[PDB]
């Protein structure tokens, strides 16, 4: 049975959207192959996203994916929240509680703020972009009081792009007014690499300095440059390259074609594209459920128009709500387990750290089986040569 | 000569409504008198509001007013930015140099910092609503920095109103 679904993705990002078409190829079973409505439309419009949001709805399709800004997330979780049709997203999570949303990005403030912890901070900075939302920024705040902190945070994108070249000279010389050795950059990779030659014209990434990446895409970076500049540098990686389940993929994943499927020939991969990846293994699996549930939901656009006042939408899409979150499985983020408000549970962070050779993990972090730190190399029982320090 | 205007009013905000309806009387010429049309909805949910929006964009009216939440204003920037239709409201403003938005309400951050300076603070907590925006938390932190102020900023809008007596 083909399954109409949504198709919503930003321009520029067809890596994920070729990550995306990687999965319609590998989850497509006999049963039932899904009907994708691609839209590579703007995200920061919410009229360019009402209309291609109110065009899937006159499909009648039963789950959408896509992205959102943090001006269109007000847009999709008042819509999907009135108009009963379950959202998937890679992108950051709402605050609210929001019904029909599924998102793809675990929370990465509780492994933020137990990093902290481990390196036992008192006063550093934190730049933060605001196109994310500014909940870690309130997260680490509740926390400033409470672990009794002097955070320095200044917003970074206010920075027009012509001339973020004279700012930041500005900029970290206002840090240098304190002399901030510890930062903690909250960007995207772009916006990351963006700050981190901003680091290299100065030159301040020598030994002394240290600083935290707050994205899940550490090993997105341009880790090369700053890896023999001095400074240390810790971050967040979600694609644990290490894992056969992950090397299998890119075994598959770099022997593409680059020019069909442009970013798919590196050996890399963005987490966006790894939980796009992962969106389609938890959709597919789904409606292998909802096919063994045999709840038939054979809709034509009887939804129709989004302006139907009142509209009330067909109510099978809530049990189809309840079921993508009790989908419980493994994938490119470790295990996959949903809350009922559809934030991500069970789930694993693995702690990177920059090192001479490279990234290099130190341990993980979990929801309640929180940060433990991973060693071995010796496995023990050895004489331990106590430094004296004098 | 009838003049077709948007009505957007939250629900129980009718004291700003019984305003607006006393500078229909004072200010209704003989030239032209304004059409309202005046729809009680929720702010909150932008599906509610463009669905308000779009009964008075099929209106053609020529200004809307109304007010909106942190929520509703990404929708209201996005569409009357695109759909050309000028708006009004006494709303906390926004960061975005917005066309066809227009904001009855003064931006307060240069009294409030030029305030903190008149009684020389150096530490201080700052309880703040999530509702209006964080951009008066984002100009007191640029401050802070700047005028070397130790700010205690803490959230208060995240407490539920059932048990908003023990936290």
Same mark, same amino acid.
């Given at each position: 049975?083909?399954?109409?679904?949504?198709?919503?993705?930003?321009?520029?990002?067809?890596?994920?959207?070729?990550?995306?078409?990687?999965?319609?190829?590998?989850?497509?079973?006999?049963?039932?192959?899904?009907?994708?409505?691609?839209?590579?439309?703007?995200?920061?419009?919410?009229?360019?996203? *009402?209309?291609?949001?109110?065009?899937?709805?006159?499909?009648?399709?039963?789950?959408?994916?896509?992205?959102?800004?943090?001006?269109?997330?007000?847009?999709?979780?008042?819509?999907?929240?009135?108009?009963?049709?379950?959202?998937?997203?890679?992108?950051?999570? *709402?605050?609210?509680?929001?019904?029909?949303?599924?998102?793809?990005?675990? #929370?990465?403030?509780?492994?933020?703020?137990?990093?902290?912890?481990?390196?036992?901070?008192?006063?550093?900075?934190?730049?933060?972009?605001?196109?994310?939302?500014?909940?870690?920024?309130?997260?680490?705040?509740?926390?400033?009081?409470?672990?009794?902190?002097?955070? *320095?945070?200044?917003?970074?994108?206010?920075?027009?792009?012509?001339?973020? #070249?004279?700012?930041?000279?500005?900029?970290?010389?206002?840090?240098?007014?304190?002399?901030?050795?510890?930062?903690?950059?909250?960007?995207?990779?772009?916006?990351?690499?963006?700050?981190?030659?901003?680091?290299?014209?100065?030159?301040?990434?020598?030994?002394?300095?240290?600083?935290?990446?707050?994205?899940?895409?550490? *090993? #997105?970076?341009?880790?090369?440059?700053?890896?023999?500049?001095?400074?240390?540098?810790?971050?967040?990686?979600?694609?644990?390259?290490?894992?056969?389940?992950?090397?299998?993929?890119?075994?598959?994943?770099?022997?593409?074609?680059?020019?069909?499927?442009?970013?798919?020939?590196?050996?890399?991969?963005?987490?966006?594209?790894?939980?796009?990846?992962?969106?389609?293994?938890?959709?597919?699996?789904?409606?292998?459920?909802?096919?063994?549930?045999?709840?038939?939901?054979?809709?034509?656009?009887?939804?129709?128009?989004?302006?139907?006042?009142?509209?009330?939408?067909?109510?099978?899409?809530?049990?189809?709500?309840?079921?993508?979150?009790?989908?419980?499985?493994?994938?490119?983020?470790?295990?996959?387990?949903?809350?009922?408000?559809?934030?991500?549970?069970?789930?694993?962070?693995?702690?990177?750290?920059?090192?001479?050779?490279?990234?290099?993990?130190?341990?993980?972090?979990?929801?309640?089986?929180?940060?433990?730190?991973?060693?071995?190399?010796?496995?023990?029982?050895?004489?331990?040569?106590?430094?004296?320090?004098?």
């Amino acid at each position: 049975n083909s399954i109409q679904i949504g198709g919503l993705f930003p321009r520029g990002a067809d890596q994920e959207y070729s990550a995306f078409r990687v999965g319609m190829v590998q989850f497509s079973t006999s049963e039932f192959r899904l009907t994708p409505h691609i839209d590579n439309l703007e995200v920061a419009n919410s009229f360019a996203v *009402t209309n291609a949001f109110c065009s899937q709805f006159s499909r009648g399709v039963y789950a959408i994916f896509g992205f959102y800004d943090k001006k269109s997330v007000n847009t999709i979780t008042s819509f999907c929240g009135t108009l009963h049709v379950s959202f998937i997203t890679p992108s950051f999570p *709402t605050d609210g509680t929001h019904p029909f949303v599924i998102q793809m990005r675990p #929370d990465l403030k509780g492994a933020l703020l137990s990093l902290i912890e481990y390196y036992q901070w008192d006063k550093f900075a934190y730049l933060y972009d605001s196109d994310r939302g500014l909940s870690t920024l309130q997260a680490v705040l509740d926390s400033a009081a409470e672990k009794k902190w002097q955070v *320095t945070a200044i917003n970074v994108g206010n920075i027009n792009n012509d001339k973020k #070249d004279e700012t930041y000279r500005s900029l970290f010389q206002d840090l240098e007014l304190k002399k901030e050795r510890r930062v903690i950059l909250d960007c995207e990779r772009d916006k990351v690499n963006d700050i981190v030659d901003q680091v290299i014209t100065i030159g301040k990434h020598v030994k002394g300095y240290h600083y935290i990446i707050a994205n899940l895409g550490f *090993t #997105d970076g341009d880790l090369l440059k700053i890896q023999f500049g001095g400074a240390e540098v810790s971050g967040f990686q979600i694609v644990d390259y290490d894992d056969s389940l992950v090397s299998k993929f890119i075994e598959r994943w770099s022997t593409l074609e680059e020019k069909e499927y442009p970013g798919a020939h590196t050996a890399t991969i963005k987490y966006t594209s790894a939980l796009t990846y992962d969106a389609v293994q938890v959709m597919t699996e789904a409606f292998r459920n909802l096919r063994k549930q045999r709840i038939e939901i054979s809709r034509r656009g009887n939804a129709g128009d989004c302006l139907a006042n009142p509209a009330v939408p067909w109510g099978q899409g809530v049990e189809i709500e309840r079921a993508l979150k009790q989908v419980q499985v493994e994938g490119l983020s470790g295990n996959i387990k949903f809350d009922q408000n559809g934030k991500r549970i069970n789930y694993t962070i693995n702690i990177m750290e920059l090192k001479t050779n490279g990234p290099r993990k130190i341990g993980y972090w979990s929801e309640v089986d929180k940060m433990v730190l991973t060693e071995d190399d010796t496995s023990g029982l050895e004489q331990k040569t106590v430094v004296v320090t004098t």
